[PDB]
Design a binder for this molecule. Structure first.
Ligand SMILES: [Mg+2]
Ligand SMILES: [Mg+2]
Ligand SMILES: [Mg+2]
Lengths: 76, 86
RNA sequence: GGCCGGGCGCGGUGGCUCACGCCUGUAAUCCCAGCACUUUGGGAGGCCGAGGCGGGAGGAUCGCGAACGCGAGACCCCGUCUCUA
């Protein structure tokens, strides 16, 4: 579902990734014309979504996206 | 099409620019194990990125060996191009 | 025999492919404008698996009647049938 609280999404999204890294995907969608940004983490069993039009969330979403990328390339 | 991570960043910038007046920029990030056929030696230090406006597609693979430089440019790219929000 | 995508809206077609808008998949790209063709035409390159149907109270998402009740649904899952260089 959609999350209205960022930190709540962040925590659930990270949990979902860690549960099975290979099954997860992280998707960003940016619409300049509409002035909104969307981030999703899904493993095709659940879809965690955070949608925003607040500029402060861009840094939050970018760091989030960045952190998950670093985890993906860290060898077990 | 697939390309080196550095060219991906250049083409990603162009995609954002093309979709400034209209359209969505999609970016997908996943862990990548090096497979090239349906399901070798699986890779454990790589991810893939894809970007598209739904018509044009670009993709790359980023390894632990290039993640630092890639992150630096990529994070800067995202912050600079996603400037339409309030 | 195939896979290298799909859905909705809008335009279009007997219909498919298709343009635009929107929502999105793959480890799996770039193209042509065609087509006994309803599992929907073709080229380069790659690969061995792939698709139909039914169900999903898995699931973003897109819509409708309204000013609560519904529909469709990428991707995924289950059942089942069929095809193979
Ligand atoms: Mg598909
Ligand atoms: Mg075609
Ligand atoms: Mg359902």
């Amino acid at each position: 579902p959609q999350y209205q609280t960022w930190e709540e999404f962040s925590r659930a999204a990270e949990k979902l990734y860690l549960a099975d890294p290979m099954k997860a995907r992280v998707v960003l969608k940016y619409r300049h014309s509409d002035g909104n940004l969307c981030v999703k983490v899904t493993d095709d069993l659940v879809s965690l979504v955070y949608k925003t039009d607040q500029a402060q969330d861009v840094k939050k979403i970018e760091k989030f996206h960045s952190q998950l990328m670093r985890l993906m390339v860290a060898k077990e | 099409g697939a390309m080196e991570s550095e060219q991906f960043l250049t083409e990603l910038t162009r995609l954002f620019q093309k979709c400034r007046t209209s359209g969505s920029v999609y970016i997908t990030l996943k862990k990548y194990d090096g497979r090239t056929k349906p399901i070798f030696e699986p890779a454990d230090n790589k991810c893939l990125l894809r970007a598209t406006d739904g018509k044009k597609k670009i993709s790359t693979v980023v390894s632990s060996k290039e993640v630092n430089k890639f992150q630096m440019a990529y994070s800067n790219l995202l912050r600079a191009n996603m400037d339409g929000l309030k």
